């Protein structure tokens, strides 16, 4: 634990977003050091955006230019932001912001989909593994062909956790935990961090007969994901959330590290449905969420 | 070795299946403890369906409802069944059957493809790793567009084996063996277990010039598979065996854990053709099968 | 270090190719033992084709029959060649050539794409891991639908390096290095070996606004690749380089071991753009290349 991080636990700060034109959006995040309970009794003093790991959800429209400000609250470590959604010059636009400073960077989100974002400061592995990852969704101008069939939707993110700030482990060791989190799209949706237990104890909710859409991304840092919902089959899958990349009837979706998808499936009966990576060593180490399906859709 | 499993070696029992209506099929399996030779001189006292690991092949038609009975012969461990093919309530329909009891569960197979099945009892990793995995094929109502080109077909399954019933190894260790097995579709086809040697010593057979279809699934538990046939290219691939997910001219097919495919390729010359996962550490640890191609198609 | 390899460092020999008919091409390679600097201060006495690892690039046209000669310069180890592009009998056409001998083998390249080649001598893992891997590109007769949009193109290959000639490490250990190399398509293109530094210090070059095509293959031996270019999104992707396998708007391309692709992306701003596998443990261990984009396209 970096001497200047000892005892530091910066309270989470809300994401700030506001539209400033028909095709322009302001976003303001922080980089901050925040204690997160990743397993019961296990605190990780994470490197975060806004005190969440993964960070807060960003949603924009295809064709929006993002005017992004990062306020670095870390007392000693520089941080930066890399959005996979955007076309940008990495050496000009994804550059470091020093402690106690801010930086603003502008770039377009030209492509629909479910994109990873993460800090881009060398060593990138260190910043991602310590918690500086997240998702930005870019909504397609023309929608998805199955939009009218979807009854309910959520966002799920997979990540790993390693021994604390240990570059040897990050490079060469198996993950200690692999976890899901959910980030809110609409008021009332849960908003959680990557931990082994919250989405088991407080399942996502749905109603019998519904078609559910999940926007998913496996942020890694290191593992691929074999994404599967127990008790159903994916009716439709759009790789990276691009409407053109359309598969049907998949049992399990292969996600690379940073890989995204939009997946849709029908829940036909009441009960609790596990959501896993089917790499079962990772599932055993935390990567199981639950979907509770009731006759009403409320608990 | 669980005290009540010491010395236990339950003889394999045939799968029971019978059609009971134009869209309804009965299946009866066992859960049982059976010694399997996974490498020469290496016995694994596997947790199995029907004394095979992977378990027996199930084939049904798209739109069939399955009335599935599990007879648990294990003297002490509960077991259950999860079919990836079906729409079901996991907490009602994939529940545990206690030792010396049976349970019956009914659910539809609405989607064509090559699906994993496995025990769903917590910890799922333990039940899969110990051998409780298999494949169910759901035949598409409308076939595949290349059906008329296929001359011969087989089923191949990839799995791993770890240190015996060792949850630490299952979670954190590399596999000791990675293996292929073949499960019979028609009388005379081989029916083998996941071992390092049988499909090398007794290759699958084909005839010069034939187009071969393989129904494949990588059941894991933990690894992905880079499926490749030496000396050919896949003419056509259907991801998860759904006819819509149609690729052409692939050298190697990426399978997630639990991932399936229908793959088709032409063998143009006499000889022996290795079949591998191209993750060559896994191939070296057992995952090489052989296809012997002769002028007649018989040995 | 095999006693007969001690002190051996065979100078690289150029690939020999010549067209001998409208649909027939001669290729002559060597198998040879050559010291390669894989990281600064770290020499690997590689098993190679032609003194390069990965080996030299081969480019042919769809429908060409290849008349391939391997001249084995290794004083003691037999070697062979397996081209993923071709239809061949592995047990007749991919056979070993003994030390100080040559062998010639003929087979057709019927399928367009970006194919791995490698030695096929048992244990195959040993020959691949020690450096005997490479790429053959088969150009599609009808092109790719986006050909007219591409301004500049390069070839990139990903491989791993392990502890020297250590079969235990090859089977059971994490890679010590994961690396990119580039192989020349046109005069003036760089031609490099798999190392941790050359494509950082001497980036690939491009011009602002260009659409870039990369022909890529992950030769392994053991890992999958999460291929990503920072600061852009792939406009179009053709899996295995087959024009039919067409995805759009992908952030990251999942490559199995031996998996290939043609990927295309636009660079909109001047700067330096990292090229990674997004499995960041591998990126940290060497697998980052750089693309320098200038107003002119020259350094
Ligand atoms: O039903 N999924 O194992
Ligand atoms: O089907 N999830 O084990
Ligand atoms: O020819 N497959 O290495
Ligand atoms: O092409 N199998 O090494
Ligand atoms: O912008 N790629 O992290
Ligand atoms: O987006 N490369 O970290
Ligand atoms: Cu407008
Ligand atoms: Cu602004
Ligand atoms: Cu950071
Ligand atoms: Cu990234
Ligand atoms: Cu509905
Ligand atoms: Cu009917
Ligand atoms: Cu019945
Ligand atoms: Cu079991
Ligand atoms: Cu499952
Ligand atoms: Cu035929
Ligand atoms: Cu001609
Ligand atoms: Cu010739
Ligand atoms: Cu060799
Ligand atoms: Cu190969
Ligand atoms: Cu252009």
Numbering used by the authors:
A (entry chain A), B (entry chain A), C (entry chain A): 17 to 315
Passage from the reporting paper:
Copper-containing nitrite reductases (CuNIRs) catalyze transformation of nitrite to nitric oxide, which has impacts on geochemical, agricultural, and medical health fields. CuNIRs typically have an ∼110 kDa homotrimeric structure, like a Reuleaux triangle. Each protomer contains one type 1 copper (T1Cu) and one type 2 copper (T2Cu) site.
The structures of D98N without NO2- and C135A/D98N with NO2- were determined at 1.05 and 1.12 Å resolution, respectively. The NO2- complex structure shows multiple conformations of NO2-, indicating that AspCAT is necessary to keep the substrate at the proper position with the configuration suitable for NO2- reduction. In contrast, our atomic resolution data unambiguously revealed three binding modes of NO2-. One is a κ1-O complex that is present only when Asn98 assumes a conformation similar to the gatekeeper (GK) mode. In the GK-like conformation, the side chain of Asn98 is flipped away from the catalytic site and cannot form a hydrogen bond with the substrate. The third binding mode is the κ1-N mode that is also observed in the C135A/D98N structure.
